């Protein structure tokens, strides 16, 4: 208290420091600024509309050449605090990911060094428009790009130089964060003749895939399949049950359809790859075709589907004659055709069923790569 | 330095906060407006609301900020907050469904002989004329009108950028949709002594080909069942029961379809075009199913002393077999053949018609994008 | 008339933040009261509500009786909100959402210290109505509110209307109803052991509801359903033998309908409150129908199978006739439906009883509150 | 400028913003309202809430705004922002669904004499009766009152100017439709107090509903069902072999009817429409119900049915005889003289009912048409 | 009066608010705390969000606050407005979802000395652990830590006092239940940085949940569908004459729980849980499938069953005797023996993994309970 009162009167901040004047030692280069990016949390991932809500520690550094102190300031306390108002504040701009203004990363507590350098590093709840596309769904699941920096100023006015990822990742993401490159830069453009403003470029390469869809989604696949696969088994064990063979295909039919229904529902949440979607619907087709097969091949058959003496000779005539008929039905039986039928069912459930997990594997060989 | 104090102090001594960047009634100040777009994030196709993001570049000149040796000739270019002036308050005639985000009160580029550049990116809640005319393959146009909101062009004039700038300069890549172009026309509604708004056109194109595909399946598949229930009658006449099961099932199906239509129009409705006729193709496989049913219906029945007993025997069997022989006559299958070739016509024809219209809808009403 | 000079005098001396206090050990006397005007949202599962309350605020401050120029110019006055001491109100009780538009309004000074101010406020709160308050006997909504600020040794509130209501300005878009409304002024000392007593304002609100629309929603399906199983029960004594399966079909049918009801209304008392009472007659009346329903089939399942060479040969054949007859005969004895006939009256009275036991008791929870 | 500095400084100095234009004890402040709803953005039935465009034309007068060559000389009448003024707290009595949009801090035009107008471009949140009775074909008149919130007739008075149609700027994108709307003035004096209170503008919105697409979809199943029903009669009499066949149908359909129901009652829940509108769909739809249930129980109804070589021949022939009897029994059980009876007995019922159904359709179609 | 003005004026003259109240490089600002949680208005389930009130009881002192007969004199302990003070920015590290509600603008306890407290009825939204594994039958302990934000050890300090339980003021109408809650203090410096970072209180909430309402209805359809499966097996022995029938009921059965599960993914997804629990109903349900798979595949199992005038009398009874042993050969397939086997077979198998489901059920809760 060493002239303290008095001295924070001397210096003045507001009155001796020109609030309105950026103390860049007059017209030169810049004062040299550095940004540090540390994610504190990632709360929500949207596949749909390429949008992520995440928290970042906005670690910022620049020298305040006016803030160089003396004994009853510097040395009195080599370290001291000063709020946002006594403080020129950049507007660091999430230059391609501030498709939602910055919160509670505006004008909050800063750290005042003992000979101008200043340190301001709080919390940023933000939204971003990261490069989703319908391609961020292959297993790679791409690399999310983001640039940070003091938006307005140029290379003669500002300069910003420059941490993983899983430091505080959301573990109740359905995704997985593989990596995390950080490297600054500066850049002039097409229309400008003159390089300027420098930025923090941070690529996020991730991956995601629950282990929960697998469980109720495959479950129906096999289930389903085996019904199309049984359908045809039952037409042997008894194919006369005509009506009730019928009920099964209505039944199997309707089941198949809603199930795929809640599939494009999560599918809107998130624009799905062409890779996976084809296999599912090219193949439940698989079945549909069969059920329609099941049809014609199941019901395709026309029918299968001495005077005294003179009188009982009428009946032995009636007898044989319709015996032709009666047997016209067993004709239809086609029972040495049996095992074929269901063997000719077996062959193609094997050729499809495999063709799929065969495809499953020709894509399950490269990723294990 | 160089007369620093002096420039600095005169300037903030004669500028006025509360005032208009104009000297009395002329001319006024010709401000420049031109927004390069960032990207668009949501088209609420249902309601006709538009949330996008662009840069409001404004720029005019301030002859009250002409500098001298040290901030003119010292550093010709200096960044200075706003607050100081006349900012564009702008609302959108149709749109401006809601405030500005990152639009106003962000620093600016002040050139030495007073040129002002202000370059702010912003999100803005709009709502354009998409209408219920954003599904025909022909798609539709829209008015986007920007302009201030208590100011009557009389102390300032507004002027544009390009005209060809397009709207597919920054059309969103993520789109399952597309862009034919965005016009820009400055206008001055005489209804009003106030010179107003500017009208920006929306000749948008909406091509998301993903699920119309498997929508194709239900129309063709559903024909399957169709063909199927009309093929079953001369296939196993005893289709009797089964057949009923075909149509409980054929009906429910088309009804659940009626389940998702509403639900899909949730985000997104318009023009029953699609709908409109697949509705008619609906009613069609309605009444054909049913009359065939009728078809089926059809059948009014179907749906010495020694020798005296023998007699009695001979008569028994032959007697009722002509009665049941009757029923054979009563259900011979003349209809089956003939209407499964009515079934030929009906199906074959109504099939390749909404095929057609959809054929024609994509291909025909597309061109008139100019 | 000294208009200027009187104003300017006491604004010399005027004190903001200082309460008009004789001394500091007696506090000020404050008058309050609320007239409901809007009961915007009754979320009773979550027991919260939103209401536009007329905050009748009154109190005394003779720091401003006036003279010649002011008392006497005008006994009445209108001078700004921001000009002293103002009460932050809140429902101890319910005040869940700080106040809306119910401040920054126009207060009322008498020329002598009478002070009146009313405002309107929409805010959130949280009433009774947990699993009860749906009956016919009402659970009184008890909301106490007071300044959330200071405690009673400087502040002390007054009151009203403990007796008289409610449906002055009750929501018409209630399926509820109020039947009394009490209002009391009280001291602070609770369960929790808190001293420094903060007065408050208790708001009892015993109200009614249940002008059911859905009721018959509920009503008709399940009458239909009882009847539908009365068809299941008497339709068998008319039905043929192919009706075993018949019947089953209806089983499928029966619960498809059943759980479609059970999905319905469960949803309802999630979205809004909860009370067991009504809930219960439904799903358990529902259960027990179920119950005897399938047991029924089990009843028409039961039963094993009901579910001289001349003469040589004429010998054997006339045997096979009357022999086998005694066979076919088996079927006769076996399916002598003593069970079916009776099974009509089984379920008949039973059906009655279930009907009665239920509606009759829903007749009581209607007939005691009658 | 013409007087430039002496102009500006004079006027700030002797001017108190706060102060409301009070000119001895008389006229108070005469200030009139004039709302011109430019257009409407959205409205909610369920929650009688509307977001609308309003340009508030506010007039009043300060004789202390007249002028000489040192204010008028300078620039005629000018543009003065709000702030300096005394602003009435306008408030939609039974509306006010919240705060006026973009109200604050706008501009106005004063005269070098004084004429002031404040006519800002508002759009806000409203609240109005709809009642059960709005989504009438006949409509309900939304009663909306406007006026001075906390100031009487002595302190001040809000007056009218303007009758004007609702369909002046009615949203074209309403599903709905107007009849007319009128607004007359009124002054509210109370038997409470001997004093003269403030003044109000009362709106009356008279409009009726319904974009006819809805209409259609729902009624067509119902003709659909008509034919099922119609089969239910026709199938059985023209063959009762597939009785259980139909059983099917009873199930598959009533559930369809159930699914329709989920759909429209949401909307019913989404939108309250005068409840006695629903009874229509009620008994109508429920007819289908009783119909079924009886037609198909009755369809069921029926007990039943839904030598000495020589003397061996006569033991045997006598066996074919009595079972000749018996045959005839059960066929004697399903006659084809009275199923015709139920045909016409109910089909006249259906043209009863049907025409009854057509009753309330046609009725308030004789009143709608008008 | 008692230095009236000399004492208040001096206090605000030599009073500052840029500065915090720091006393040399020391013990930090001795910050006291502890809990007063009395209400939990809302908390979700899905997003483990909690909006509760807790009065933040803070306690610390500022020497500058020491007094003589000119301020202690006065009135002992007077209560200052909040404004004056350097408040700590407290926050829920692993929470913080916003916003402490109603902290600004308050009341602050001063003593003639200095003793100072302010217990603020803060209500806010939170986010802490629980996850998938909260509702277990072994429980979870949401870890909630609180403490200053941007400020390490070297400067600043808070500390806990006291053990108090959870169930202290737990929500009574909790679909849910607490067991215990503990809060202990600490200071967390890291091996990262050589720097003493901040102090914090960490709550741990230990409580098990789940209403039973979901439980009574989960169980229901279980039992009941187990009935039908139980019938699925008894059928074929009492009623094999309905074989086709037992198929229907599979088509029936299966689509019905398949549908049950639709619900679930809607609701589960909506009210989150460790998938570990579904794995119960999984196999137990797939079981009914897996069991009608083998039992009706089995059921269908079986190929078949799934003089010269004297001479023709002999040609004829012959006709009968040859056939008769032949047909013996399809009956030979359906012995009505091994049907009793397969239901015994699986009766026990379903009695046992029935007791199974009652197993994990109750096991789970023999572990819950503990």
Domain limits, chain B: 1-208, 211-297+340-366
Distance from C-alpha of D154 to C-alpha of B328, rounded to nearest angstrom: 101
Angstrom distance (rounded) from CA D79 to CA C137:
64
Q: Cβ contact (<8 Å) for D251 and C253? A: yes
Alpha carbon separation from A261 to A266, B215, D31, D73 (Å, rounded): 9, 12, 61, 76
| Whole-Å CA distances, B316 to B319, C67, E34, E119 | 6, 130, 105, 107
Give the HSE-up count for residue B46: Cα atoms under 13 Å, Cβ half-sphere.
Answer: 8
Residues D173 and D251 both lie in one domain? no
Distance in angstroms between the alpha carbons of the first and the last residue of chain C: 69
Cβ-nearest to E306 among A122, A237, A316: A237
The b-or-e profile of C309-327 (16+ CB within 10 A means b, else e) is eeeebeeeeeeeeeeeeee
Cross-strand pairs, A204: A144
Coil vs helix vs strand at E144: strand
Is residue D313 assigned to a domain?
no
Contact E244, A246 (CB under 8 A): no
Q: In whole angstroms, how large is the CA radius of gyration of chain E? A: 38
Closest residue by Cα to residue E360 from E292, E278, E291 = E278
- Show Cβ contacts of residue B293 under 8 Å, excluding neighbours closer than 6 positions: B243, B247, D231
Q: Contact at 8 Å (CB) between D266 and D332? A: no
Is residue A290 within 8 Å of A228, Cβ to Cβ? yes
Kindly give the pairing relationship between strand D30-32 and strand D157-159: parallel
Residues D242 and D102 in one domain: no
Instruction: Give the span between the Cα atoms of C289 and C291, in whole angstroms.
Output: 5
Q: Which residue has the tokens 């048409």?
A: D369
Kindly state whether residues D135 and D235 are assigned to the same domain.
Answer: no
Q: Which residue of C has its CA nearest to D97?
A: C122
- Element (DSSP H or E) covering residue D319: helix D310-331
Chains that touch A (3 or more CB pairs under 8 A): B, E
Q: What are phi and psi of C7, to 5 degrees?
A: -30, -60
**Which chain E residue is nearest to residue C242, measuring alpha carbons?**
E242
Method: cryo-EM
Nearest CA in chain C to E74: C24
- Domain co-membership, E204 together with E237: no
How far is the C-alpha of A297 from the C-alpha of A300, rounded, in Å?
Answer: 5
Encoding tokens for residue B237?
């006449």
Q: Which of helix, strand or coil describes residue D207?
A: strand
**How would DSSP label each residue in A291-321?**
HHHHHHHHS--SS----HHHHHHHHHHHHHH
Please, what sign has the CA dihedral across residues A52, A57, A60, A66?
A: positive
**Does residue D306 contact residue D333 with C-beta atoms inside 8 Å?**
yes
Q: Using CA coordinates, name the residue in chain B closest to D214.
A: B262
- Helices A274-298 and A242-259 pack at an angle, to 10 degrees, of 170
Give A89's DSSP letter: -
For testing the chain C interface, which of E57, E238, E261, E340 should be mutated: the one with the most C CBs within 10 Å? Answer: E238
CA B195 to CA B147: how far, in whole Å? 9
C84 vs C60: CA distance, rounded Å = 13
CB B117 within 8 A of CB B59: yes
Q: Is residue E1 part of a domain?
A: no
Optimal mutation site among B309, B311, B313, interface D, most CBs of chain D within 10 A: B309
Query: What's the maximum distance between 2 C-alpha atoms anywhere in chain E?
Result: 154
Q: What's the rounded Cα separation, in Å, for the pair B234 and B295?
A: 12
Contact at CB, E314 and C309, closer than 8 angstroms: yes
Does D89 reach chain C within 8 Å, measured CB to CB? yes
Q: Is C314 at the interface with chain D, CB within 8 A?
A: yes
Q: Which of B241, B258, B293 sits opposite D242 (nearest CB)?
A: B241
Inspect the structure and tell me whether chains C and B have 3 or more CB pairs less than 8 Å apart. no
- Tally the C-alpha atoms within 13 A of residue C8's C-alpha that lie toward its C-beta: 5
**Residue closest to B274 by CA, chosen among B284, B261, B263:** B261
Residue with tokens 């990742």: A169
The reply to whether residue B106 touches residue A152, judged by beta carbons under 8 angstroms, is yes
User: Taking CA atoms, what residue in E is nearest to A314?
Assistant: E312
- Number of Cβ within 10 Å of residue E75's Cβ equals 14
Helix residue spans in A32-166 (DSSP H): none
Complete DSSP assignment for D165-204 = -GGGS--TT-SSEEEEEEEEEEE---TTSSS---EEEEEE
Residues in a beta bridge with E142: E205
E38 Cα to chain A: minimum distance (Å): 29
Q: Decide if C316 and E244 are in contact by the 8 Å CB cutoff.
A: no
Strands E157-159 and E30-32: parallel
Same domain for D259 and D185? Answer: no
Task: Quote the tokens at residue D362.
Answer: 């046609």
What's the rounded Cα separation, in Å, for the pair E211 and E175?
4
Are E241 and E138 contained in the same domain?
Answer: no
Q: CA D280, CA C215: separation in Å to the nearest integer? A: 17
Chain A residue with Cα closest to E302: A237
Q: Which is nearest to B35 in space by CA: B94, B116, B122?
A: B122
From 1.20.58.390, 3.30.70.260, 3.50.50.60, 3.40.50.10380, which CATH number describes the C215-367 domain?
A: 1.20.58.390
Alpha-carbon torsion (C343, C349, C353, C354), positive or negative: positive
The answer as to CATH 1.20.58.390 being correct for domain B211-297+340-366 is yes
Residues linked to residue C202 through DSSP beta bridges, in sequence order: C144, C184
Rounded to whole angstroms, the Cα distance separating B80 from B101 reads 20
Token code pair at residue C247 = 């019947």
The residue among A93, A99, A128, A130 whose CA lies nearest residue B53 is: A99
All residues at 6 or more sequence positions from C45 whose CB lies less than 8 Å from its CB, including other chains: C269, C270, C271, C272, C273, C274
Q: Please spell the DSSP secondary structure of B25-91, one letter per residue.
A: SSS--EEEEEEEEEEEEEEETTTTEEEEEEEEEEE-B-TT----TTTTSS-S-EEE-S-SS-----E
Phi, psi of C51 (to 5 degrees): -140, 145
- Resolution of the coordinates, Å: 6.2
Tokens representing residue A129 in the block: 């428009």
A213-300+334-361 in CATH: which number? 1.20.58.390
CA separation for the pair A55, D161 (Å, rounded): 55
- In a shared domain, residues E121 and E199: yes
Distance between CA E244 and CA E266 in Å, rounded?
34
A4-208 in CATH: which number? 2.70.170.10
What are the structural domain ranges in chain A? 4-208, 213-300+334-361
**How far is it, in rounded angstroms, from Cα D341 to Cα D347?**
10
φ, ψ of residue A146 in degrees (nearest 5): -145, 135
Domain extent at residue D26? 4-208
Q: Per the CB < 8 Å rule, is A244 touching E244?
A: yes
Are both E117 and E89 inside the same structural domain?
A: yes
The answer to whether the Cβ–Cβ distance between D151 and C78 falls below 8 Å is yes
Assign residue D8 the CATH number of its domain: 2.70.170.10
How far apart CA E314 and CA E322 sit, in angstroms, is: 12
The DSSP element (H or E) to which D37 belongs, if any, is strand D35-44
Place of tokens 């239940």: E177
Query: B1-208 belongs to which homologous superfamily?
Result: Neurotransmitter-gated ion-channel ligand-binding domain (2.70.170.10)
Do both D272 and D291 map to the same domain? yes
Torsion A143-A149-A151-A157 (CA) sign: negative
Q: How far apart are CA A56 and CA A37, in angstroms?
A: 7
Cβ-Cβ contacts under 8 Å, C309 against chain E: 307, 310, 313-314
Q: Contact, A201 vs A184, CB < 8 A?
A: yes
Tokens standing for residue C354? 């279930």
Q: Tokens for A199?
A: 């930025």
User: How many domains is chain D partitioned into structurally?
Assistant: 2
Distance from CA of D238 to the nearest CA of B (A): 6
Determine A/E contact with 3+ CB pairs under 8 A as the test: yes
Rounded Cα distance, D149 and B279, in Å: 54
Instruction: Tell me, yes or no, whether D309 lies in a domain.
Output: no
The verdict on C309 touching E (C-beta cutoff 8 Å) is yes
How many CB atoms within 10 Å of residue C139? 17
> Which residues does chain E have within 8 Å of residue C126's beta carbon, measured at their own beta carbons?
41
CATH of the domain at E227: 1.20.58.390
In angstroms, the CA D155 to CA D147 distance is 14
Q: With beta carbons under 8 A apart, name residues in chain C contacting D312.
A: 314, 318
DSSP C48-105: EEEEEEEEEEEEE--TT---TTTTTT-S-----TTSS----EE-SSS--S--SS-SSS
Chains E and B contact (Cβ–Cβ under 8 Å for 3 or more pairs):
no
Sort residue D190 into left (φ over 0), alpha (ψ -120 to 50) or beta.
beta
Copy the structure tokens of residue B95. Answer: 């749109």
Instruction: Give the count of beta carbons closer than 10 Å to the beta carbon of residue C64.
Output: 19
- Alpha-carbon distance B342 to D81, whole Å? 80
Q: What's the CA gap between D93 and D201, in Å, rounded?
A: 10
* Assigned architecture for domain C20-209: Distorted Sandwich (2.70)
Which residues from chain E sit within 8 angstroms of residue A83, using beta carbons? 18
C256: closest CA of chain E, how far (Å): 7
Query: What are the extents of the domains in chain C?
Result: 20-209, 215-367
Spell out which residues of chain A touch residue B245, defining contact as CB-CB under 8 Å.
243, 246-247, 250
* Neighbour count for residue B349 (Cβ, 10 Å): 9
**DSSP-based helix, strand, coil % in chain B, nearest 5:** 40, 15, 45
User: Are C111 and C71 in contact, with CB atoms under 8 Å apart?
Assistant: yes
Write down the number of H helices and E strands in chain D: 6, 13
Decide if A177 contacts A204 (C-beta within 8 A).
yes
**CB-CB contact of C197 with C189 (8 Å):** yes
C314 touches chain E (CB under 8 A): yes
Which positions 323-352 of D are in contact with C (Cβ < 8 Å)? Answer: none
**What is each CA distance from E298 to A364, D282, E159, E233, E330, in whole angstroms?**
38, 48, 72, 11, 16
For residue E47, what is the DSSP state?
T
Pull the structure tokens for residue C349: 């009275």
| Beta carbons of C250 and C243 less than 8 angstroms apart | no
Task: Give CA–CA dist A152/A149, Å, rounded.
Answer: 9
> Which of E265, E293, E312 faces A262 most closely, judged by CB atoms?
E265
Report whether A155 contacts A207 (CB < 8 A): no
**B193's tokens:** 């002594």
- Give the list of residues 6+ apart from residue D187 with CB closer than 8 angstroms, or none: D153, D157, D196, D197, D198, D199, D200
d(CA B152, CA B193): 8
């Amino acid at each position: 208290v060493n002239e303290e009162e008095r001295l924070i009167n001397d210096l003045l901040i507001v009155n001796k420091y020109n609030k309105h004047v950026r103390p860049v030692k007059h017209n030169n280069e810049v004062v040299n600024i550095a940004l540090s990016l540390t994610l504190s949390n990632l709360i929500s991932l949207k596949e749909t509309d390429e949008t992520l809500t995440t928290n970042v520690w906005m670690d910022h550094a620049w020298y305040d050449h006016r803030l160089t102190w003396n004994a009853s300031e510097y040395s009195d306390i080599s370290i001291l605090r000063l709020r946002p108002e006594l403080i020129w504040i950049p507007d660091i701009v999430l230059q391609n990911n501030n498709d939602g203004q910055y919160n509670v990363a505006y004008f909050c507590n800063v750290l005042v060094r003992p000979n101008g350098y200043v340190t301001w590093l709080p919390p940023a709840i933000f939204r971003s428009s990261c490069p989703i596309n319908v391609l961020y769904f292959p297993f790679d699941w791409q690399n999310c790009s983001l640039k940070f920096t003091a938006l307005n100023y140029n290379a003669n006015e500002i300069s910003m130089d420059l941490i993983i990822d899983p430091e505080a990742f959301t573990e109740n993401g359905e995704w997985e964060i593989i990596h995390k490159p950080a490297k600054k830069n500066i850049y002039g453009d097409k229309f400008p003749n003159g390089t300027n403003y420098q930025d923090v470029t941070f690529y996020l390469i991730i991956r995601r895939k629950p282990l929960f869809y697998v469980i109720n989604f495959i479950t129906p696949c096999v289930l389903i399949s085996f019904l199309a696969a049984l359908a045809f088994y039952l037409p042997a064990e008894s194919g006369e049950k005509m009506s009730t063979a019928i009920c099964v295909l209505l039944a199997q039919a309707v089941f198949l359809l809603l199930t795929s229904q809640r599939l494009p529902e999560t599918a809107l949440a998130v624009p799905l790859i062409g890779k996976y979607l084809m296999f599912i619907m090219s193949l439940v087709t698989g079945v549909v075709v069969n059920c329609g097969i099941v049809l014609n091949f199941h019901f395709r058959t026309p029918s299968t589907h001495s005077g005294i003496d003179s009188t009982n000779y009428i009946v032995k005539q009636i007898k044989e004659k319709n015996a032709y008929d009666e047997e016209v039905g067993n004709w239809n039986l086609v029972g040495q055709t049996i095992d074929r039928l269901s063997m000719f069912i077996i062959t193609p459930v094997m050729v499809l069923g495999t063709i799929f997990i065969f495809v499953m594997g020709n894509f399950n060989r490269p990723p294990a790569k | 330095s160089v007369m620093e104090d002096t420039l600095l102090s005169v300037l903030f001594e004669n500028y006025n906060p509360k005032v208009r960047p104009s000297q009395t009634v002329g001319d006024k100040v010709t401000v420049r407006v031109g927004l390069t777009l960032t990207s668009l994030l949501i088209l609420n196709e249902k309601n006709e609301e538009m949330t996008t993001s662009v840069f409001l570049n404004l720029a005019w000149t301030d002859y009250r900020l002409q500098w001298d040796p040290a901030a003119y000739e010292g550093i010709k270019d200096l960044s200075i907050p706003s607050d100081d002036v006349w900012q564009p308050d702008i609302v959108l005639m149709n749109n401006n469904d809601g405030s500005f985000e990152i639009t106003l009160h962000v620093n600016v580029l002040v050139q030495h002989t007073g040129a002002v550049s202000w370059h702010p990116s912003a999100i803005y809640r709009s709502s354009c004329t998409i209408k219920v005319m954003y599904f025909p393959f022909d798609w539709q146009n829209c008015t986007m009108v920007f302009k201030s909101y208590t100011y009557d062009t009389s102390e300032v004039i507004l002027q544009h950028a390009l005209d060809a700038m397009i709207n597919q300069d920054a059309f969103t890549e993520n789109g399952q949709w597309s862009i034919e172009h965005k016009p820009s026309r400055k206008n001055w509604r005489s209804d009003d002594p106030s010179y107003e708004d500017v009208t920006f056109y929306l000749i948008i194109q909406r091509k998301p080909l993903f699920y119309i595909v498997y929508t194709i399946v239900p129309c063709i598949l559903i024909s399957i069942l169709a063909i199927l229930v009309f093929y079953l009658p001369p296939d196993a006449g005893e289709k009797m029961s089964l057949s009923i099961s075909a149509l409980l099932a054929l009906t429910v199906f088309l009804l659940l379809l009626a389940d998702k239509v509403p639900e899909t129009s949730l985000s997104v409705p318009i023009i029953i075009s699609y709908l409109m006729f697949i509705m008619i193709l609906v009613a069609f496989s309605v009444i054909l199913s049913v009359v065939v049913l009728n078809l089926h219906h059809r059948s009014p029945n179907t749906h010495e002393a020694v020798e005296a007993i023998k007699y009695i025997a001979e008569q028994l069997e032959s007697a009722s077999e002509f009665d049941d022989l009757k029923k054979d006559w009563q259900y011979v299958a003349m209809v089956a053949d003939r209407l499964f070739l009515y079934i030929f016509i009906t199906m074959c024809s109504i099939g390749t018609f909404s095929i057609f219209l959809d054929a024609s809808h994509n291909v025909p009403p597309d061109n008139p994008f100019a | 008339n000294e208009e200027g000079r009187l104003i300017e005098k006491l604004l010399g001396d005027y004190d903001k933040r200082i309460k008009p206090a004789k001394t500091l050990d007696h506090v000020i006397d404050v008058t309050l009261k609320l007239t409901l005007t809007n009961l915007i949202s009754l979320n009773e599962k979550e027991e919260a509500l939103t209401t536009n309350v007329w905050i009748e605020i009154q109190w005394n401050d003779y720091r401003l009786s006036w003279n010649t120029s002011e008392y006497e110019g005008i006994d009445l006055v209108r001078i700004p909100s921001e000009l002293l001491w103002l009460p932050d109100v809140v429902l101890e009780n319910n005040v869940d959402g700080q106040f809306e538009v119910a401040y920054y309004a126009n207060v009322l000074v008498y020329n002598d210290g009478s002070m009146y101010w009313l405002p309107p406020a929409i805010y959130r709160s949280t009433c009774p109505i947990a699993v009860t308050y749906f009956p016919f006997d009402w659970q009184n909504c008890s909301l106490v509110f007071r300044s959330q600020t200071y405690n009673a040794h400087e502040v002390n509130l007054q009151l009203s209307a403990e007796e008289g209501i409610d449906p002055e300005d009750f929501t018409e878009n209630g399926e509820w109803t109020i039947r009394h409304r009490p209002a009391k002024k009280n001291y602070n000392w609770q369960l929790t052991k808190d001293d420094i007593d903060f007065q408050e304002i208790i708001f009892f609100l015993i109200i009614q509801r249940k002008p059911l629309f859905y009721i018959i929603n509920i009503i008709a399906p399940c009458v239909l359903i009882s009847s539908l199983v009365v068809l299941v029960y008497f339709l068998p004594a008319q039905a043929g033998g192919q009706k075993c399966t018949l019947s089953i079909s209806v089983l499928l049918a029966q619960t498809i309908f059943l759980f479609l009801i059970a999905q319905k209304v469960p949803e309802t008392s999630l979205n809004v409150p909860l009370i067991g009472k009504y809930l219960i007659f439904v799903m358990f009346v529902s259960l027990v129908i179920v119950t005897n329903c399938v047991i029924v089939l089990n009843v028409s399942l039961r039963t094993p199978n009901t579910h001289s060479c001349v003469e040589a040969c004429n010998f054997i054949a006339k045997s096979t006739k009357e022999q086998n007859d005694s066979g076919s005969e088996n079927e006769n004895w076996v399916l002598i439906g003593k069970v079916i006939d009776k099974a009509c009256f089984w379920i008949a009275l039973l059906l009655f009883s279930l009907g009665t036991l239920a509606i009759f008791l829903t007749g009581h929870l209607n007939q005691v509150p009658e | 400028s013409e007087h430039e500095t002496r102009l500006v400084a004079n006027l700030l100095e002797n001017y108190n913003k706060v102060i409301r234009p009070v000119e001895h004890h008389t006229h108070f402040v005469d200030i009139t309202v004039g709302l011109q709803l430019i257009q409407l953005i959205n409205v909610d039935e369920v929650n009688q809430i509307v977001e609308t465009n309003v340009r508030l034309r506010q007039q009043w007068i300060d004789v202390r705004l007249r002028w000489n060559p040192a204010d008028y000389g300078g620039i005629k009448k000018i543009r003065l922002p709000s702030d300096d003024v005394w602003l009435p707290d306008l408030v939609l009595y039974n509306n006010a669904d919240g705060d006026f949009a973009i109200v604050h801090m706008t501009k106005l035009l004063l005269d070098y004499t004084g004429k002031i107008m404040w006519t800002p471009p508002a759009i806000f949140k409203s609240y109005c009766e709809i009642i059960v009775t709005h989504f009438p074909f006949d409509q309900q008149n939304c009663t909306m009152k406007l006026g001075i919130w906390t100031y009487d007739g002595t302190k001040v008075s809000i007056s009218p100017e303007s009758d004007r149609p609702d369909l002046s700027t009615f949203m074209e994108s309403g599903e709905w439709v107007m009849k007319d709307y009128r607004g007359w003035k009124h002054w509210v004096y109370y038997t409470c107090c001997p004093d003269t209170p403030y003044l109000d503008i009362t709106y009356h919105f008279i409009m009726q509903r319904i974009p006819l697409y809805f209409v259609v979809n729902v009624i067509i199943p119902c003709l659909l069902f008509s034919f099922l029903t119609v089969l239910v009669f026709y199938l059985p009499t023209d063959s009762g072999e597939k009785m259980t066949l139909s059983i099917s149908v009873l199930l598959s359909l009533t559930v369809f009817l159930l699914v329709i129901v989920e759909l429209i009652p949401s909307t019913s829940s989404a939108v309250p429409l005068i409840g006695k509108y629903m009874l229509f769909t009620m008994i109508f739809v429920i007819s289908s119900i009783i119909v079924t249930v009886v037609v198909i129980n009755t369809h069921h109804r029926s007990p039943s049915t839904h030598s000495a070589i020589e003397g061996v021949k006569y033991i045997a022939e006598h066996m074919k005889s009595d079972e000749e009897s018996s045959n005839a029994a059960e066929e004697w059980k399903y006659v084809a003289m009275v199923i015709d009876h139920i045909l016409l007995c109910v089909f006249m019922l259906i043209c009863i009912i049907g025409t009854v159904s057509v009753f309330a359709g046609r009725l308030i179609e004789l009143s709608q048409e008008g």
